[PDB]
Symmetry: C3
Subunit: 456 residues, 3 copies
C-alpha cells in the first residue's frame, strides 16, 4: 500500500488560500481527502534587501519566502504555476514531499507570460521546502525562489495560540554588506558559499522591531522554519528560551527541550515555544557572524507580567541586538534616497546616523555620548572630536589606541577598527554625533570618508 | 562484558570478497562468528575526475570510494594492506568501528611495495567510513583514500531488492571546475575548505545517465551512503522522493520519513527507499551549488508504470539535471584528447558543444535553438549570431542586455554572464551552434575565447 | 506549570565552586532546590594560542573555555559578573538554558572595573553554552568568551569514573597558522568564516601529549563537549572508539553507539565513553583539515593491559598525530623567545626543529633520517643535502620531483611542496637535520628561508 491511502478525493474541489510570510493559512480542519487547487505566480521585482540596498528578487507570490501552502496528507493537489509577463527568466517548481521525478520540475516549466499545471498526491505528511528548479538552479534559489508547503497529518496538528512562518536564506551581492544601491547577484561568491547577507524572510529587519512576531505569556507558538539555502546550514537557535519540540520534515523523530538545532540546506522543521516571561526572544543562525554581522536575526516579542522568581533581568537592548533594537531604521532608507536624488540634508544624515549609532557606537560611548569617565571617552561635547573631524573619520575606519586626552581626562585604551562600515554609514554616524550633545555641527560626507579610506 | 561477545571464531577462515562502487558484497548470511581475512591494495593512478580533466587519485582497491568491506558483528578481522610498488607515498588505514588507537593506523603503515597486517574484533555493528591516516592526512583523504565497511548485526539486515554504495567527497584542484588537463591537488583550497568539485563516487557523472543506479516500481533499495570529506558536511537529499529510514553509523536511533539529512564529514548512513512511480530520483548535497555547479548529483532510475493518481508529470530533463540528463558526455572527452593531440576537427567541437549546450543554453534557447518569439531569441538560423561571431563569444562570457533585433523581432531582456564556462567550453558550444540549424558553419577556437575573456 | 517546579530554595545559600578546563565540579549531590551564588570575573590577557604565537584572549575566569558552572534543575541562581579593571572592553553574559531575554545579557552589562548581577531560575536541565553578548558579539566570542553550564536533573547524572570539559572554538588571526608573534584578531577572516586555528580548550596542544585526559581500561568517561564557535559546526568524532551515548543540551533524545556527531555552533553535548583497550583516543573535528592542519585534536589516553583478541595493533604515533605525538613542543616556544631576544643559538634551533620534524618530515624520511632505500631518500649523512643547503630550503618550500641521486642510489619520486611551513619552521627543521646524523652542521636562518620563498 502507498502511504496517505485515504481513498479518492471527496467533497468539493478546494481553492487553496495561500498566505504571505510570516503568516500561515488556517488549519485545514477536514476529515476527508480533497482535490486542492493551488495557484502560484512568479514575479521578478526589485525590493529592499536592506535599508537603501535594492536587489532583484525572483519570487513565488511576490514575497521571500514564497506563499505558504497548506494541505492534508492524502489530498490530490492540482498545482498551477504562472510566470508573470514582466519576467525575463523561465521558472518551475520542485516541491519537497512530492512523489515523482523533480518534485514537479519538468511539468512546471513556465516561460514568461505562460502557465503550467501538474497534479500530485500528497502521500507524505510533514513540513517541506519548495523551490525553483530552473537552470542555473542555484541562481534561482539565491534570488529568493523558495517557500514552505505543510502537509498536515489526517487528524491535524495540535492546537496552538499562534502559527508563524520563518525562512532563512543566504544571499550573494556584488557589493559588500550594507553597500547602497541596486546590487547584482554575484555568482562567484555563490559558488564559494560566501554570502554577503544571511536573512530571515528576505530582508534585514524583516522580523525585528515593529515587524516582530508577537505572543503573550502563557501562550504557545508554533513556527514553521525553512532553510532555503542555497548553501548554508543553520545552527538555528532561540536566545533566552528553549524549543519544547523540534520535528524535521515529516520525520517520526521528535526532539524535545533543545535550544540549538541544525537545519540542512533545503530542510525544514516545525518548532514549538511556550512563552514564560516577557521580552524579546531572538531566532538566530548561531554561526554567529551570520546573525550579528549579516542579518540573520528575527524576534518573537512576548507581552505580559514579569516573574522575578524566574528572571530578574531586563529586556534586550542595543548591546546585544545592535541597531535592530529600535522599531525600524527608516531614516537610513530616506537618507540613501536623498543622496540618489541629490537632496541630502544635514538632518537627513543626522537621523540616519542616529539609527546607525545604536549598538555600533553606543555600546562603549553610551546612547547619550557620555562614555564612562577614564574608561570610554565622551562623544558628548567632545573637545577631541571638535578639534579634528578628519581624525574622527580615521578613528572610525582604522581604530585608535594609546594615551589621549578628552575633556580634560586621560584615556589609554583601544577602540577597534570599524572598516566594515560603508562610507555613507561613517559619514552619517559622524554627522549625527557632530549635531548632538553641544558638538559644533557641520557634516561629514561619504566622499570625505572615501578619501580617508584610500589614504589612512 | 564487551559488545559483540559471541565467542571465539568458528568454521573456516573466510576470505572477504570486496566490491567496487556502486556495488555491495552479498549479505554475510551467517549465524556464527568467523575469522575474516581482508586484503586491500593501495594504487595511485590518474583517472578522469571530469571529461577531459585528469587527476592523480590515491585509492584503496583502484576506485574512489575504495572497495566495500562487509563483515558480521563479533567477527575477528585479519586486515592486510598492500601498497602497490608504483606508489610514491606511504599509506595506512583508520577504520571507523575498530576498537583501538588510530583505528588501525600505526600497525598498517605501508611503504610502496610493502605489506602490513593487523587484527581487530568487530565489536560495533554499523556502517563506517575507513580512510587513510598518513601525514598529511587531509591530502591523502582529498586524493580519494576513503571507503565503507559494513559490520552487520548478528541476524543480518532486513532483505531488500537492491543494495548500492554511494560516497560523497570534496576535491581540490589547482584549476577551476571543468578546466581541462591533469590537475594537481591544491593545498590552499583544501585548508580553506573551498573545493572545486564535490562528487559522488570519484567523478562527475559517476552515477548519472548510463551509469545510474536502477530499480523498478514496488522495489526496495538500500543505499550505504558515506561522506569521506575531507571537509564538507552533506545536506544529503533525494529529489522527488523520501527516505523510509535513515540510520547513522551503528546508532540506536533510526529516523523515518525524511527527505533531507545531514551527514558529517567522516560520517556514514544507511538509507532505505521504496520505489513508487517511475523516473529519475536525484541524490544531492542540497547545499545546492555543490550539486548543480560542482558535480554532486547521482541518479536512481526507476522503471515501471506511471500512476497518474500519484504523479501526473514528466521525467526529469535538462532544465533541472543540466548536461547530465543525457546518457554521457563522451564527446567532451574526445574533443579534449583531440586538442591535446593537435587533431581537433570541426565535428569534434560540434559533438562536444552539443553535449554542453543541454541545460546550460537550452533552458532558454530550447534544444532546437528556436527560443520563444519575443521572449528568448533564436539561435536557429540567427541573423544576429551570423553577423558577428566575436560578439557571440562576448555574450556568452559577459552576458547581454538591452533591446536587440533577431530575425526581425525585438527582444528586451537579460542573458546573464556565463563566465564560469572555460575557453574550450565556450568555443565548442558556439561551434555546435554555428554548425546547426542552417547557421553559417565555421568554428570558434579556445584561443579566440581566451582573447575575448582578456579584453571584454 | 513551569518545568523545574520543585518549590522555593531551601537549605543555605551555596557559593558555587567553579572549575577550570578540562576539569568539572563535583556532582551537586543534593535533593532540594537551592539558591546558588555564582561569581565569574572577566579577564583580558595574552596567552599562547600556539608555541611562540601570542593572542589577546578575552576570558571568563582566566581560561578558554571559561570556568565550568554546575547547578541543579530548579535552583535559583544569583549570577555575579565582574569585569577586571585591566579590561579595555565592556562585557556581559548570555547563558543558554536561562529563561529570559538575552539569557541575562541586558542585566549583566559590565564596564571595566564594575560588577553586575542578575537572578534566574534554572528551569531547564541540560548542558548549555554560555558566552559574551556584547557588541560586536562575534568578536567577543572569537576572542574566547564562552564556556559551559551544566544544569543537572534532580536525581543527578549516573555515576562515572571521570568527567572532563572540552570545548571547540574557531579563531581568526591576522597571521597565518603558526606564524609567530602577537597575532591580532582578524575581522575579515571571521566574517568569511575562514579560521586560522580551530582548537579545543583555547590552544594548540591544550589536550595532547603531557596534557592529555586520562583513564584506565574498564572505566567510564563522561565528556561535556561545547562548541563555542563563533562560526563552525563540528563533525565531532573519536578516533579508534565509539560513544556509548550522545545527548545534546537538555534534549529528550539520546543517541547511542555512534562515532561521529554534528555539534552546532553554540551547541553542547554530553558524551560517554567506556575504555576497552589501552592507547590514545583522539577527539577531532572530522572536517579533517581542522583537526590535522589547524589544531583541532585532543587526546584521551587509556592505561591498562592490551587485549590482542580485540586489537592486535600499536599505539598511535607521529604518522597520524604528527608533531603532537610527543609530550610537548616546548623547544619551539623557547626558540621563538630566543629569536625575539636576539639570542637564538644553533642548539635552540636544533631542538625546535627536532620537535617540528616529527610526522611533518619523519613520515617519509623516518625519525632517524634513514628513509627507505630507493623509495624515500635519507636525510641521515646525506650527500645531496650537504652539497647545497639553499637547494634544501627550496625543496621544503617548493617540493622536489624527478630523478636524483642520494648516497649512491637513484630516486625517482615526488616530495610535495610544504609551503604552509613558516620561515622559522623551515629554518629550524633544516638546522636540526644539518646537526644530526653526521651531517655537516651549520644553520639555516628564517631570513635565509624568506629569501628563497620570495624567489623560487
Ligand atoms: C568600545 C569597543 C568602542 C566602540 C564600539 C566605539 N568606540 Fe570610539 N572609542 C573607544 C575608546 C576606548 C576610545 C579611546 C581610545 C584610546 O586611545 O584610549 C575611543 C575614541 C573615540 C573617539 C575619539 C575620542 C573622543 O572624542 O571621545 C571618537 C571620535 C570615537 N571613539 C568615535 C566612535 C564612534 C563614532 C563609534 C561608532 C562608529 C565608536 N567610537 C565606537 C571605544 C569604542
Ligand atoms: C536564459 C537565462 C538564457 C540562457 C541560459 C542563455 N541565454 Fe542566450 N540569450 C538570452 C536572452 C534573453 C537573450 C537576449 C538578451 C537581450 O538583450 O534581450 C540572449 C541572447 C543570446 C545571443 C544573441 C541573440 C541571438 O542570436 O539569438 C546569443 C548568441 C546567445 N544568447 C547564446 C547563448 C548560448 C550559446 C548560451 C549557452 C552558453 C546561452 N545563450 C544561454 C537568454 C539566455
Ligand atoms: C613523503 C611524502 C615526504 C615528506 C613528508 C617529506 N619528504 Fe623530503 N623527500 C621525499 C622524496 C620522495 C624525495 C625525493 C624526490 C625525488 O625527486 O625523487 C625527498 C627529498 C628530500 C630532500 C633531498 C634529498 C635528500 O637529501 O635525501 C631533502 C633535503 C628533503 N626531502 C627534506 C625533507 C624535509 C626536511 C621534510 C620535512 C619538512 C621532508 N623532506 C618531507 C619525500 C618526502
Ligand atoms: Cu526560477
Ligand atoms: Cu530541493
Ligand atoms: Cu594514503
Ligand atoms: Cu576518521
Ligand atoms: Cu565580552
Ligand atoms: Cu548563544
Amino acid at each position: 500500500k502507498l502511504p496517505g491511502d485515504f481513498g479518492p478525493p471527496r467533497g468539493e474541489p478546494i481553492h487553496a488560500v495561500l498566505t504571505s510570510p510570516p503568516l500561515v493559512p488556517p488549519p485545514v480542519n477536514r476529515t476527508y481527502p480533497a482535490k486542492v487547487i493551488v495557484e502560484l505566480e512568479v514575479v521578478e521585482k526589485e525590493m529592499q534587501i536592506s535599508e537603501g540596498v535594492s536587489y532583484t528578487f525572483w519570487t513565488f507570490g511576490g514575497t521571500v519566502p514564497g506563499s505558504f501552502i497548506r494541505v492534508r496528507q492524502g489530498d490530490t493537489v492540482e498545482f498551477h504555476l504562472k510566470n508573470h509577463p514582466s519576467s525575463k527568466m523561465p521558472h518551475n517548481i520542485d516541491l519537497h514531499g512530492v512523489t515523482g521525478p523533480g518534485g514537479g520540475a519538468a511539468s512546471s516549466f513556465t516561460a514568461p507570460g505562460h502557465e503550467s499545471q501538474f497534479t500530485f498526491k500528497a502521500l507524505n505528511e510533514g513540513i517541506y521546502v519548495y523551490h525553483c528548479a530552473t537552470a542555473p538552479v542555484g541562481m534561482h534559489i539565491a534570488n529568493g525562489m523558495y517557500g514552505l508547503i505543510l502537509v498536515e497529518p489526517p487528524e491535524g496538528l495540535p492546537k496552538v495560540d499562534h502559527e508563524y512562518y520563518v525562512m532563512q536564506g543566504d544571499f550573494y551581492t556584488a557589493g559588500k554588506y550594507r553597500e547602497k544601491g541596486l546590487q547584482p547577484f554575484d555568482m562567484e561568491k555563490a559558488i564559494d558559499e560566501r554570502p554577503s547577507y544571511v536573512l530571515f524572510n528576505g530582508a534585514e529587519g524583516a522580523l525585528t522591531g515593529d515587524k516582530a512576531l508577537h505572543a503573550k505569556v502563557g501562550e504557545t507558538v508554533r513556527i514553521f522554519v525553512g532553510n532555503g539555502g542555497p548553501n548554508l546550514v543553520s545552527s538555528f537557535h532561540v536566545i533566552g528560551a528553549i524549543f519544547d519540540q523540534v520535528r524535521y520534515e515529516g520525520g517520526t523523530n521528535v526532539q524535545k527541550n533543545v535550544q540549538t538545532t541544525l537545519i540542512p540546506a533545503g530542510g525544514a522543521a516545525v518548532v514549538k515555544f511556550t512563552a514564560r516571561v516577557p521580552g524579546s526572544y531572538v531566532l538566530v543562525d548561531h554561526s554567529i557572524f551570520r546573525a550579528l554581522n549579516k542579518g540573520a536575526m528575527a524576534i518573537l516579542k512576548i507581552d505580559g507580567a514579569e516573574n522575578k522568581l524566574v528572571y530578574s533581568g531586563k529586556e534586550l537592548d542595543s548591546v546585544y541586538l545592535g541597531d535592530r533594537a529600535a522599531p525600524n531604521m527608516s531614516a537610513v532608507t530616506k537618507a540613501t534616497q536623498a543622496s540618489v536624488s541629490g537632496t541630502l540634508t544635514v538632518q537627513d544624515q543626522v537621523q540616519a546616523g542616529r539609527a546607525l549609532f545604536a549598538g555600533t557606537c553606543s555600546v562603549c560611548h553610551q546612547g547619550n555620548g557620555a562614555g564612562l569617565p577614564g574608561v570610554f571617552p565622551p562623544l558628548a561635547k567632545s573637545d577631541f572630536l571638535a578639534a579634528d573631524p578628519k581624525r574622527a573619520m580615521n578613528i572610525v575606519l582604522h581604530g585608535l589606541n594609546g594615551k589621549i586626552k578628552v575633556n580634560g581626562q586621560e584615556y589609554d585604551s583601544v577602540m577597534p577598527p570599524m572598516t566594515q562600515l560603508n562610507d555613507d554609514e561613517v559619514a552619517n554616524i559622524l554627522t549625527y554625533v557632530l549635531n548632538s550633545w553641544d558638538n559644533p555641527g557641520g557634516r561629514v560626507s561619504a566622499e570625505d570618508v572615501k578619501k580617508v579610506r584610500a589614504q589612512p
